[PDB]
C-alpha cells in the first residue's frame, strides 16, 4: 500500500513486487484483488497480484487501466520449477515488442484472439531460485486489451504440444512489468 519489494498476501491474493533497485516506481496494494503501480523513469520492475501456487487450469479475470509510456507489459506471469520456466501470456504492452529476439513456435486462439507462441532463454538471470539459466515461454496477444478473462489451460496446452514442458507451478500473477520507462496502471484480479 506503497510497499517496497516483497512477497505476501492481502485478502486471499498473493502479491509479488520485484525491482532491480532503480528509483521511479510506487507499488500500492489496494483491497482484495487490486493494485496500482505508477512509475516515472523506472528501472526494471515486475509487480502484481494473484495466486501462490498457480494452477494449469485457472481462468483469470482482470480489469482496470494500463497506460504505458514506453517499454512495459501487462501479462499473466508466473513460474514453474523442475524445469525452471518463466512464462508470459501478454495481453497488452507499450512501445517494445516482446517477440524481438524470439523464436516463433506457433499460434493458439483463446479468449477472443489468436496469440503467437515464442520461446527465448535467459542465461544467468535472476529467477525465483536465484541466478539461473531457464527458458522463457510467451503467448503474445495480437489484439491488445486491458481487461478480460484468460483461460490459462489453452496456453499451457499449446505450449505443451510445441514441446514446451512445465514443472511444478510457483506463483501466477497478473503483472505489469516495466523496463526503464514511465506509465500508470490500476488493475483488479479475480
From Swiss-Prot:
InterPro entries referenced in this protein's UniProt entry, alphabetically: ConA-like_dom_sf (IPR013320), GH11/12 (IPR013319), GH11_AS_1 (IPR018208), GH11_AS_2 (IPR033119), GH11_dom (IPR033123), Glyco_hydro_11 (IPR001137)
EC assignment: 3.2.1.8
Domain spans labelled GH11: 1-190
Gene3D superfamilies according to UniProt: 2.60.120.180
Family named by the database record: Belongs to the glycosyl hydrolase 11 (cellulase G) family.
Gene Ontology molecular-function annotations: endo-1,4-beta-xylanase activity
Species annotation: Trichoderma harzianum
Entry keyword annotation includes Hydrolase: yes
Name of the protein in its database record: Endo-1,4-beta-xylanase
Pathway assigned in UniProt: Glycan degradation; xylan degradation
Domain of life: Eukaryota
Swiss-Prot/TrEMBL GO biological process terms: xylan catabolic process
Active site: 86 (nucleophile), 177 (proton donor)
Signal peptide start and end residues: none
Catalytic activity: Endohydrolysis of (1->4)-beta-D-xylosidic linkages in xylans
Keywords, sorted A to Z: Carbohydrate metabolism, Glycosidase, Hydrolase, Polysaccharide degradation, Xylan degradation
Lineage of the organism: Eukaryota, Fungi, Dikarya, Ascomycota, Pezizomycotina
Amino acid at each position: 500500500q506503497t510497499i517496497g519489494p516483497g512477497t505476501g498476501y492481502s485478502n486471499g491474493y498473493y502479491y509479488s513486487y520485484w525491482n532491480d533497485g532503480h528509483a521511479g516506481v510506487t507499488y500500492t496494494n489496494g483491497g482484495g484483488g487490486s493494485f496500482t503501480v505508477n512509475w516515472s523513469n523506472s528501472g526494471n520492475f515486475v509487480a502484481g497480484k494473484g495466486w501462490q501456487p498457480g494452477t494449469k487450469n485457472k481462468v483469470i479475470n482482470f480489469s482496470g487501466s494500463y497506460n504505458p509510456n514506453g517499454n512495459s507489459y501487462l501479462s499473466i506471469y508466473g513460474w514453474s520449477r523442475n524445469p525452471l520456466i518463466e512464462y508470459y501470456i501478454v495481453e497488452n504492452f507499450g512501445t517494445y515488442n516482446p517477440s524481438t529476439g524470439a523464436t516463433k513456435l506457433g499460434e493458439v486462439t483463446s479468449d477472443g484472439s489468436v496469440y503467437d507462441i515464442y520461446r527465448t532463454q535467459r542465461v544467468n538471470q535472476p529467477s525465483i531460485i536465484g541466478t539461473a539459466t531457464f527458458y522463457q515461454y510467451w503467448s503474445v496477444r495480437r489484439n491488445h486489451r486491458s481487461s478480460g478473462s484468460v483461460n490459462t489451460a489453452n496456453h499451457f496446452n499449446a505450449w505443451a504440444s510445441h514441446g514446451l514442458t512445465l514443472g511444478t507451478m510457483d506463483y501466477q500473477i497478473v503483472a505489469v512489468e516495466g523496463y526503464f520507462s514511465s506509465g500508470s496502471a490500476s488493475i483488479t484480479v479475480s
